[PDB]
Amino acid sequence: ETKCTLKSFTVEKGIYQTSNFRVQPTESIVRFPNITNLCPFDEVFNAT
Amino acid sequence: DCTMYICGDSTECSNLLLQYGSFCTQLKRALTGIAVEQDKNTQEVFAQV
Amino acid sequence: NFNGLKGTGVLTESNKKFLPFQQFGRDIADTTDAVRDPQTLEILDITPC
Numbered sequence: 001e002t003k004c005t006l007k008s009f010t011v012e013k014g015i016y017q018t019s020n021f022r023v024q025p026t027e028s029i030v031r032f033p034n035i036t037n038l039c040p041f042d043e044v045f046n047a048t
Numbered sequence: 049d050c051t052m053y054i055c056g057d058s059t060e061c062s063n064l065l066l067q068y069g070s071f072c073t074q075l076k077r078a079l080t081g082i083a084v085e086q087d088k089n090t091q092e093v094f095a096q097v
Numbered sequence: 098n099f100n101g102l103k104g105t106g107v108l109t110e111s112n113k114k115f116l117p118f119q120q121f122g123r124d125i126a127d128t129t130d131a132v133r134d135p136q137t138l139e140i141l142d143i144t145p146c
């Protein structure tokens with residue numbers, strides 16, 4: 001990893017720095033305020 | 049850190065940052081020059097003995 | 098994606114509570130960090146990476 005960072009096949013005796021912490025993406029979630037006050041379709045297909 | 053500051057939690061910016069070249073190699077090696085000098089400044093004033 | 102809140106991050110429970118007129122939450126960076134949950138009444142913190 002630090003050989004990849006330094007763009008060389010040899011590194012020197014010392015502290016270096018690589019890419020920081022990041023949790024890789026796994027999935028996606030979607031949610032929304034739940035279903036209320038539905039449109040009056042029961043009247044318009046079950047009309048007497 | 050370059051990638052996760054200018055583009056937080058977006059993996060498409062990792063592709064667009066590498067094609068700008070050695071900007072972030074220069075900027076990281078610039079601020080490391082300060083970050084090693086501050087150790088040298090404190091050792092210069094106090095540690096003559 | 099909380100009704101248009103696009104972004105990626107991990108989700109924790111926040112001890113603080115919002116007022117009934119409040120739905121979102123900002124920070125110094127002016128972005129979403131802790132919001133009220135859409136379909137259930139508790140406050141969820143978006144902990145970043």
Ligand SMILES: *[C@@H]1O[C@H](CO)[C@@H](O)[C@H](O)[C@H]1NC(C)=O
Nearest residue numbers: 041042043044045046047048
């Ligand atoms: C519409 O009417 C039919 C017949 O009475 C019934 O079976 C059906 O359940 C009704 N629709 C709804 C949504 O209740």
Ligand SMILES: *[C@@H]1O[C@H](CO)[C@@H](O)[C@H](O)[C@H]1NC(C)=O
Nearest residue numbers: 033034035036135136137138
């Ligand atoms: C919607 O969510 C709220 C909060 O959890 C709950 O009180 C309500 O009963 C829910 N309604 C439906 C139709 O699920």
